[PDB]
């Protein structure tokens, strides 16, 4: 949803220009939603300030739009679930973007009107720059945690051939701690398991009958421990490979199964410890960046009005929400209402777009 902020002089009072445009814009058709926009009188000064600000605010506008858009994307990146509630979370002053823009108020406490336009612009620039610095830090932390959780997910993904042994291994299936004895682990496709149950007793010399103990099974395969004498292992593994069986050794590795379980408990918990503060920080940073963006838009309108008419300014600030079916007729009405003042327009024009979240 796109909104236009516009301004033009009253002939003797601001009501004359407001009534003429508001009546015409409403009466001809629903060309736009028409309302007053709050811009207060600031302490004006020389053309060196005004012209500098006019271009500097355009750089700041591009920057803050990029920042607040990145905040909206980061909110969608942190909110992995409940994606439909993102617009209900991206609120300014407890209300939706459209409402806040229509009901906009200048923050005289953050931005005292007696200050020069440069000082106001620098307070905005510093505030938004530190929001961007905080976002760089938080995004770096969140993206790394997300990436590390995906590595633990990959380690537990797919069949018995690809998932970690830590989920299925227990000490009771193993023969270990021995001079002459070994345990090995093998994966076999489920169609070959009925042959494997006898074939393992014959793949090497010095293998006992009934040596195979199953850990787990899935839609593709069985994974079993095999117990045997130490001389048998190389022929056993080689002849298993000749018979298409896959070796996947894990001799009750307590350190490896512990490390996967510790990281699962840690990463699953640290995700919440990031997520809660991230949603709260992103809501604050969104509100402040969106508020600051509108303060830049208001300054672009103000500075251009002051340039276009001179320092004793009498411009009304107004908002339009253009109808997509009749925006060309709206442009023609706005030109006709202001043809005496001089894309390009004879009146002051700027736009805002609420589609920060795509």
């Amino acid at each position: 949803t796109e909104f236009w902020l516009i301004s033009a002089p009253g002939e003797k009072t601001c009501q004359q220009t407001w009534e003429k445009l508001h009546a015409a814009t409403t009466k001809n058709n629903n060309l736009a939603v028409s309302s007053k926009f709050n811009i207060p009188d600031l302490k004006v000064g020389t053309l060196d300030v005004l012209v500098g600000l006019s271009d500097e605010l355009a750089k700041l506008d591009a920057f803050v739009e990029g920042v607040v858009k990145k905040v909206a994307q980061y909110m969608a990146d942190v909110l992995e679930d409940s994606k439909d509630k993102v617009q209900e979370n991206l609120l300014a002053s407890g209300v939706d973007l459209v409402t806040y823009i229509t009901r906009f108020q200048w923050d005289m406490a953050k931005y005292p009107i007696k200050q020069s336009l440069k000082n106001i612009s620098e307070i905005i620039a510093k505030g938004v720059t530190q929001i961007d610095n905080d976002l760089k830090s938080r995004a770096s932390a969140y993206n790394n945690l997300k990436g590390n959780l995906q590595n633990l997910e990959r380690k537990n993904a797919g069949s018995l051939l690809t998932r970690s042994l830590a989920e299925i291994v227990k000490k009771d299936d193993f023969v270990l701690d021995s001079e002459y004895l070994v345990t090995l682990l093998v994966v076999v496709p489920k169609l070959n398991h009925n042959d494997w149950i006898k074939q393992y007793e014959t793949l090497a010399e010095m293998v006992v009958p009934r040596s195979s103990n199953v850990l787990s099974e899935d839609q593709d395969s069985y994974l079993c421990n095999v117990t045997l004498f130490k001389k048998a292992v190389d022929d056993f593994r080689h002849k298993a490979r000749e018979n298409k069986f896959i070796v996947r050794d894990f001799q009750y590795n307590e350190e490896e199964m512990r490390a996967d379980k510790e990281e699962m408990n840690r990463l699953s918990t640290d995700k919440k410890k990031q997520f809660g503060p991230l949603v709260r920080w992103l809501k604050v940073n969104f509100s402040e960046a969106f508020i600051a963006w509108i303060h830049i838009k208001a300054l672009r309108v103000f500075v251009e009005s002051v340039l276009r008419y001179g320092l004793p300014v009498n411009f009304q600030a107004m908002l339009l929400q253009p109808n997509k079916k009749s925006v060309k007729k709206l442009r023609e009405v706005l030109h006709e209402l202001y043809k005496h003042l001089d894309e390009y327009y004879p009146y002051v024009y700027y736009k805002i777009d609420c589609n920060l979240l795509e």
Binding site: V44, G45, T46, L47, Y309, G310, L311, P312, D342
Partner: protein, 54 residues
């Protein structure tokens, strides 16, 4: 575009009046700061000079 030129002439005539007032306000503000600074520096320096003799 003669009427636009006349409007701009009148606007420029307004810009200089308030820029000249802005420069005067900066000079008057600096003069009040420098009044307090010069008075302070002179009084303390001469007080110290007289105090050294005392």
């Amino acid at each position: 575009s003669d009427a636009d030129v006349q409007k701009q002439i009148k606007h420029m005539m307004a810009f200089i009046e308030q820029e000249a007032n802005e420069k005067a306000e900066e000079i008057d503000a600096k003069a009040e700061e420098e009044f307090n600074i010069e008075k302070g520096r002179l009084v303390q320096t001469q007080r110290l000079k007289i105090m050294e003799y005392y």
